[PDB]
Design a protein around this ligand. Structure first.
Ligand SMILES: Nc1nc2c(ncn2[C@@H]2O[C@H](COP(=O)(O)OP(=O)(O)OP(=O)(O)O)[C@@H](O)[C@H]2O)c(=O)[nH]1
Ligand SMILES: [Mg+2]
Lengths: 198, 10, 570, 180, 415, 18, 142
């Protein structure tokens, strides 16, 4: 399991485009070998290396099931890596985010404020036309809570759902009523943005 | 180099 | 920095002057404007060491146009160095004098050039010959006044074959820019003398010796036969440019040779192995070799008629070579190797290069159109490519089928059924228009021509001008042929192209079609659905006037681009 | 090389094994997995994605990957076919109209050249209503005996009660492990 | 007719420039990099660029592009030949062709560039001859450049007179996916390392088919070289007259002649490979190598490259003879065999996984290339007959030569 | 020894052709 | 809302990328290349605003590495610059003397900070200390 810093240094050590491509392929071969064995200990390092390779301009199609598997994991680092992979290499046209709806729903009711917040941010960033349809009920539940750190995330998720699904704005009218008295600046800004979008 | 310099120098 | 360098260069120590010169040379190469220190380096110019003299001369040459006024302090040094006993010093001084682009300096350099013109050292003679050409290029009037043409002419008829080749090259360069007045052409004796030193010239001198014969025009078969016999040994030269120059010279001389004699056949047979050897050169020269073959292919296509296996594009071949390979195969394509050409094109259609795939499709279509004996094979290959489910391949196959149908549509009714349902959802204007034209012209073997045109009429008012015109023509043809199932379709097309169509040409075409329909529908069958004459295929052969001129310009920029020399130079 | 460490690990139990959880939606797959892992009938919403869990029994870590029976998730079973050693099929005997769909889905999933070492594991879910068939009528309808080179075993498990889960686990362990 | 010969780098910086005519501004080199980038990004990149009225024709080196700007209708072939000669001279003088020597050997590099070409017309290109007048560690120029013989310096003396020859064969086969070979040509290469005293006039004699027919012995094994390219020292007139190969060998290793004739015989190595690639499940490589060469010859260092999937992972190789290793950098299975006796048959059974998610774009089917190299085996059957080493002083030479058979463009098209 | 085939001595000319 | 954010170096290499619009990978790469070419082919007095594809492409690089944004033509232009400056200040405070070297190696931290700051192209926390405290608490979780 090569570290992210070591992979970055190795990539920076390549000068020619062919040499950089060869190094990227050599790293991707080891990453794919580790992934095919169902590795769970050094999965975060492999995910980081795959994300770095994809950002540098290399294919990362094979690293799709690994992100979904890490999303439904229990480790905080693994969950964060899976969320980052879903946000970066996952989109509406990917066609592999359909199975991520169950993971998002499972993580939407998590007691931890970081896993739920990360899931909400991922849903807002990669909202699809069908994910919001099956996630609209859970978004409204979090919008009526008194969590200042979660109120902004709920408002952003509702705004993203409304933008993706203009017909779902009717379910947010009774949830945003009497929400202009928030002391926190972020909550007030989120409420104002949601009202302007509506 | 030009990379080790601070983005804002604060 | 600058002050320290100037102080070091203005010192009496050679160990510091050499270091300063090296630093100045490195700064200029590193990209530092050291032209402000040119007057300071002028004092440290007349040095006994040859290592620092070369650097000073290079700095002066590179810092001569920038500071022409400061270069007036070097004429005396050049004059003194032009008489050194060492031939290397004299050659360096001669080269530096001609490399200085100073209007007030070349005038005083005529005397050293005249002195070095008759230099006994062959290196000195070559340097003087190069300097004469440089001065003539800089100032033709000064060279003419100095009377260097007579000295240059006598250089060819003297010893030192390298010096003779250099003088010949200088004379050719001077005459190249000259207005053809007082040409340096020579009689057969001069040609024989040049050929005698051709076998003793170096690799670079061979090009200079063979370029002179490119301008001479033989007048008799005996002279042409001798020239061909003397140029024949040049085909076995390791230098790629030497072989190309020899081939060009042989091609030029073949314009006066007689095909009745066996010399023409021997020359043709001895030229194919040279082309085969040149085809296996470096990738950089591969494009030049392909261009030369294409230029000579349209002139003497009977030499490389059997050379088809060597024209196959390799897996590691470059894009510029792979593209030229398809053109070479198309030019040399015939019924003898039609199967081989089809197999090569089929393999070239499975690659990943979109441009390469398009070029292969175009070559296959050109081969099918040129040779009617392989029309069925080309149609089958196009159908297989379309069935391959490739968007670019599908568009290329549609274009090829549309082109073939207009040229050979007599027995093209067996492919309309397959093309009736061939993924018509493609939005390529070059493919949709071709499919519409094929359906309109071939609306006899398809029983659902009206139904197929319905999908293309949804956005006929905003699809395209050419696409809209093709759709209107197909609708008119269908109405003229079968007006029972397209009676309402014709009216709808006329309403959409005449009322909601703002295109001037499209509106005029729609109005004309409506007038023809409302005036005499029976006459529209003989007017619109008439038998068009044979379509004149675009010949790829160049004009004979350009081919004759392009024959003399072989291996130059005018041959690779296939353009006249005056249409690309500035 | 030396295999002393492997022998020491195997002296107290080293094999873990794997398992799959596929079948039609509302077939008791999620409830069966909850009973196997926890031991209670937990009510859950339909599996839009998938559920991954593990079961520790007989010194073997029986990892269960629940897969929903949704139409949009039916063709997604090929994602779990990579690096998979076991497969459990959950039938729905209470849905006569869905029995044909479940059989077709099982046949489609069983007609893959990559999933060959995964033995058949037929679980009779919803074994609490009188309309549920026996352990042979369902197998006869599904044609489990016609699966060449497939080791299938039909077991009836009650979601509400949990009877037969131990027998199914023992059968899976015996099929996976071929030692004493 | 180059206007300014310059050497670029991988970042667009001109390592060294040397104008020869001055008709092209030195600032045109800056636009060469954007033009090359635009051509590469649109598929129109070519070795000869065009910046308005100035054409930038150059080749690609190991680390820098030796682009030579020109403005008139200069000979592109001449420019390419000059660039090749400059590259050869740099390789002879500097063991490495990279930016490490461009910025460290400028003192001698500038002198070599100035002496090589004057006014755009090269005059001296022999590395051995040029090394006697331009050194990095100056006397009068040698008489060899002025004399006709510019490839053999006079006065060379050695303790012994031994010349080592190298008859290197290049077996190139273009086998299509259908199983037939389209381009099957063998190009000979007679490279000799002449080390003698004086200026001997070598008289090379082989069992050429044309020579045998002319002498009347056109019935034994004769090499039918379709194209023969002699070196500069080889006299073209002598070869044209009566097939007499008479030339003065140079001091060092050089290529005397380069034969090139077609081959109509069966390939030395026959590769029967199959692809049982499952649809996103697995892949099988039933590759079998059959040696059609003579059993007395061994193909040392046999490397049959099998292109495996680019995204394949967890691969397994079930072969019989030779180590099989998959290199992710090359994305192919290297069937490396140390010793391959003639007539041997090696069978391999590849097995690698594949991701469930399909690839976004196609990757193509690169051809399978073998790297067989069987020494002491001449496929063309050409054998050296005599080598007339004649010296005015008179000495007993000890010529030597070896025959090496290798694989050139021996690629096999995939299915 | 040497990889690629041992070097062999060459003749001087075609002794059988005079 | 910001359509996309691309942190590219002066040499053209991109150290960060965050697009809020679902676009194809080839299309996204082409758009990034075009944005890099436009920014790299612009002077220092271009107003730091480019109308590319009807998008207020605002470029404001405080070091060798440049910054880009894609703001729709419905809000003020100075808001994007203020948001970029606030994000840069927050990243510097979280990291401590943030340079180009720490951006490449600590790309995950920058991505997490961006996710915790802006979600869906809109602002999530107006303050600069609350976001830093939340990021520190999330990192300390393990
Ligand atoms: N009361 C009762 N219901 C059962 C029994 N067996 C199966 N079910 C039904 O089967 C469903 C099981 O759903 P889950 O446990 O959440 O998971 P699942 O079987 O994969 O169903 P999906 O999530 O929709 O794919 C329940 O909703 C029940 O209605 C049983 O023994 N008793
Ligand atoms: Mg379930």
């Amino acid at each position: 399991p090569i570290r992210l810093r070591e992979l970055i240094r190795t990539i920076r050590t390549a000068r020619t485009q062919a040499e950089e491509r060869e190094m990227i392929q050599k790293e991707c071969a080891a990453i794919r070998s580790s992934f095919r064995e169902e590795d769970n200990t050094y999965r975060c390092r492999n995910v980081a290396k795959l994300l770095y390779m994809h950002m540098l301009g290399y294919p990362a199609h094979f690293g799709q099931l690994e992100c979904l598997k890490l999303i439904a994991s229990q480790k905080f680092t693994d969950k964060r890596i899976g969320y980052l992979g879903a946000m970066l290499l996952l989109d509406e046209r990917q066609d592999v985010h359909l199975l991520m709806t169950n993971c998002i729903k499972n993580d939407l009711n998590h007691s931890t404020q970081f896993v739920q917040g990360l899931a909400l941010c991922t849903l807002g960033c990669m909202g699809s036309s069908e994910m919001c349809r099956d996630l609209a009920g859970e978004v409204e539940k979090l919008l009526k809570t008194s969590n200042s750190y979660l109120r902004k995330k709920a408002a952003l998720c509702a705004v993203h759902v409304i933008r993706k699904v203009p017909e779902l704005m009717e379910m947010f009218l009774p949830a945003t009523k009497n929400l202009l008295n928030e002391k926190n600046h972020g909550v007030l800004h989120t409420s104002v943005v949601l009202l302007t979008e509506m | 180099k030009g990379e080790n310099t601070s983005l804002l120098h604060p | 920095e600058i002050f320290e360098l100037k102080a070091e260069l203005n010192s009496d120590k050679k160990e510091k002057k050499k270091e300063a010169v090296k630093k100045v040379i490195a700064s200029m190469t590193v990209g530092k404007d050291v032209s402000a220190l040119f007057p300071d380096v002028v004092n440290c110019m007349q040095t006994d060491n040859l290592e620092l003299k070369k650097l000073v001369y290079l700095y002066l040459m590179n810092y001569a146009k920038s500071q022409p006024d400061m270069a007036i302090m070097a004429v005396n040094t050049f004059v003194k160095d032009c008489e050194d006993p060492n031939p290397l010093i004299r050659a360096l001084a001669v080269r530096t004098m001609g490399c200085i682009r100073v209007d007030k300096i070349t005038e005083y350099l005529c005397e050293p050039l005249r002195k070095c013109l008759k230099d006994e050292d062959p290196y000195v003679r070559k340097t003087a010959a190069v300097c004469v050409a440089k001065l003539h290029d800089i100032n033709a009037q000064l060279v003419e006044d100095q009377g260097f043409l007579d000295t240059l002419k006598d250089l060819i008829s003297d010893s030192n074959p390298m010096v003779v080749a250099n003088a010949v090259a200088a004379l050719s360069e001077i005459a190249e820019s000259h207005p053809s007045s007082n040409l340096l052409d020579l009689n057969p004796q001069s040609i024989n003398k040049l050929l005698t030193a051709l076998n003793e010239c170096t690799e670079w001198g061979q090009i200079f010796i063979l370029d002179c014969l490119a301008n001479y025009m033989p007048k008799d078969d005996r002279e042409a036969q001798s020239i061909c016999e003397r140029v024949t040994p040049r085909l076995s030269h390791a230098n790629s440019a030497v072989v190309l120059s020899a081939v060009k010279v042989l091609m030029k001389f073949m314009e006066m040779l007689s095909k009745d004699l066996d010399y023409y056949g021997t020359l043709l047979k001895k030229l194919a192995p040279p082309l085969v050897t040149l085809l296996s050169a470096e990738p950089e020269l591969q494009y030049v070799a392909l261009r030369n073959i294409n230029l000579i292919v349209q002139k003497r296509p009977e030499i490389l008629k059997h050379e088809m296996k060597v024209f196959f594009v390799k897996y590691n071949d470059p894009i510029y070579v792979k593209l030229e390979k398809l053109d070479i195969m198309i030019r040399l394509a015939s019924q003898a190797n039609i199967a081989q050409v089809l197999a090569e094109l089929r393999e070239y259609a499975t690659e990943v290069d979109v441009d390469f795939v398009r070029k292969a499709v175009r070559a296959i279509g050109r081969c099918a159109i040129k040779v009617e004996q392989s029309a069925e094979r080309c149609v089958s290959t196009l159908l297989d490519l379309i069935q391959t489910k490739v968007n670019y391949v599908v568009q290329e196959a549609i274009v090829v089928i549309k082109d073939i149908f207009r040229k050979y549509p007599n027995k093209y009714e067996s492919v309309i059924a397959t093309l009736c349902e061939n993924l018509d959802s493609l939005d390529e204007p070059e493919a949709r228009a071709a499919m519409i034209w094929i359906v309109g012209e071939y609306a006899e073997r398809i029983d659902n021509a009206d139904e197929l045109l319905e999908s293309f009429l949804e956005g006929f008012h905003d699809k395209s001008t050419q696409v809209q015109l093709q759709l209107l023509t197909a609708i008119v043809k269908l109405f003229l042929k079968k007006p029972t199932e397209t009676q309402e379709l014709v009216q709808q097309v006329l309403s959409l192209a005449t009322q909601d169509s703002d295109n001037p040409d499209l509106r005029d075409r729609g109005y004309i079609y409506w007038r023809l329909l409302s005036t005499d529908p029976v006459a529209a069958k003989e007017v619109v659905l008439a038998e068009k004459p044979l379509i004149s295929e675009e010949t790829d052969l160049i004009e004979p006037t350009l081919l004759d001129e392009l024959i003399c310009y072989i291996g130059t920029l005018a041959s690779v681009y296939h353009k006249p020399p005056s249409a690309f130079v500035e | 090389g030396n295999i002393f460490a492997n022998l020491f690990k195997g002296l107290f139990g080293k094999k873990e094994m794997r398992i799959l959880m596929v079948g039609l939606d509302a077939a008791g797959k999620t409830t069966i997995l909850y009973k196997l892992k926890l031991g209670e009938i937990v009510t859950t919403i339909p599996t839009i994605g998938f559920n991954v869990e593990t079961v520790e029994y007989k010194n073997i870590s029986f990892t269960v990957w629940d897969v929903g029976g949704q139409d949009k998730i039916r063709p997604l079973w090929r994602h779990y076919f990579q690096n998979t050693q076991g497969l459990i099929f959950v039938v729905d005997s209470n849905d006569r109209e869905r029995v044909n769909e479940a059989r077709e889905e099982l046949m489609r999933m069983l007609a893959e050249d990559e999933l060959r070492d995964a033995v058949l594991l037929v679980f009779a879910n919803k074994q609490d209503l009188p309309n549920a068939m026996n352990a042979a009528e369902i197998t006869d309808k599904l044609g489990l005996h016609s699966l060449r080179h497939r080791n299938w075993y039909i077991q009836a498990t009650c979601a509400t009660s949990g009877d037969g889960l131990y027998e199914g686990l023992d059968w899976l362990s015996n099929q996976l492990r071929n030692q004493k | 007719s180059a206007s300014a010969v310059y050497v670029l780098d991988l970042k667009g910086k001109v390592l060294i420039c040397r104008n020869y005519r001055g008709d092209v501004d030195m600032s045109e080199v800056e636009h060469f990099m954007p033009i090359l980038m635009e051509k590469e990004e649109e598929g129109m990149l070519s070795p000869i660029l065009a910046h308005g009225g100035v054409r930038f024709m150059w080749i690609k080196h190991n680390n820098l592009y030796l682009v030579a700007t020109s403005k008139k209708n200069a000979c592109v072939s001449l420019v390419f030949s000059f660039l090749y000669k400059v590259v050869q001279v740099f390789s002879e003088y500097f063991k490495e062709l990279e930016e490490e020597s461009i910025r460290d050997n400028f003192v001698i590099i500038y002198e070599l560039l100035d002496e090589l070409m004057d006014f755009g017309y090269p005059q001296t290109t022999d590395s051995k001859i040029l090394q006697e007048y331009i050194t990095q560690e100056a006397p009068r120029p040698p008489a060899t450049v002025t004399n006709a013989v510019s490839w053999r310096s006079e006065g060379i003396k050695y303790r012994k007179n031994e010349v080592f020859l190298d008859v290197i064969e290049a077996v190139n086969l273009l086998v299509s996916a259908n199983g037939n070979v389209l381009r099957s040509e063998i190009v000979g290469s007679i490279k000799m390392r002449v080390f003698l005293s004086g200026m001997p006039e070598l008289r090379l004699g082989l069992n050429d088919k044309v020579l045998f027919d002319n002498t009347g012995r056109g019935k034994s094994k004769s090499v039918e070289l379709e194209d023969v390219k002699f070196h500069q020292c080889v006299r073209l007139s002598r070869f044209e007259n009566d097939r007499t190969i008479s030339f003065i060998p140079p001091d060092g290793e050089f290529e005397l002649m380069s034969y090139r004739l077609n081959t109509h015989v069966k390939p030395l190595i026959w590769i029967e490979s199959v692809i049982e690639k499952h649809s996103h499940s697995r892949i099988e490589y039933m590759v079998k190598a059959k040696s059609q060469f003579k059993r007395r010859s061994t193909a040392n260092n046999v490397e049959i490259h099998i292109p495996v999937p680019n995204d394949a992972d967890s691969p397994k190789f079930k072969t019989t003879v030779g180590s099989v290793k998959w290199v992710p950098e090359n994305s192919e299975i290297v069937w490396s065999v140390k010793s391959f006796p003639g007539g041997k048959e090696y069978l391999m059974r590849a097995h690698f996984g594949l991701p469930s998610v399909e690839a976004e774009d196609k990757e193509g089917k690169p051809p399978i290339s073998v790297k067989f190299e069987i020494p002491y085996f001449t496929t063309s059957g050409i054998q050296v007959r005599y080598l007339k080493i004649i010296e005015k002083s008179g000495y007993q030479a000890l010529p030597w030569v070896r025959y090496i058979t290798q694989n050139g463009d021996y690629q096999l098209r995939t299915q | 020894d040497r990889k690629g085939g041992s070097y062999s001595q060459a003749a001087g000319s075609d002794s059988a052709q005079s | 809302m910001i359509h996309f954010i691309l942190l590219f170096s002066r040499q053209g290499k991109l150290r960060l990328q965050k697009w809020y619009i679902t676009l194809p990978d080839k299309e996204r790469k082409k758009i990034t290349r075009e944005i890099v070419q436009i920014i790299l082919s612009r002077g220092h007095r271009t107003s730091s605003f480019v109308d590319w594809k009807e998008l207020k492409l605002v470029y404001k690089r405080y070091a060798s590495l440049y910054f880009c944004c894609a703001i729709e033509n419905q809000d003020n232009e100075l808001l994007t610059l203020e948001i970029v400056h606030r994000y840069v200040e927050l990243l510097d405070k979280y990291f401590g003397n943030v340079c180009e070297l720490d951006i490449i190696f600590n790309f995950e931290k920058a991505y997490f900070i961006l996710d915790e700051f802006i979600i869906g192209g809109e602002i999530q926390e107006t303050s600069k200390k609350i976001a830093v405290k939340a990021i520190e608490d999330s990192d300390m979780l393990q």
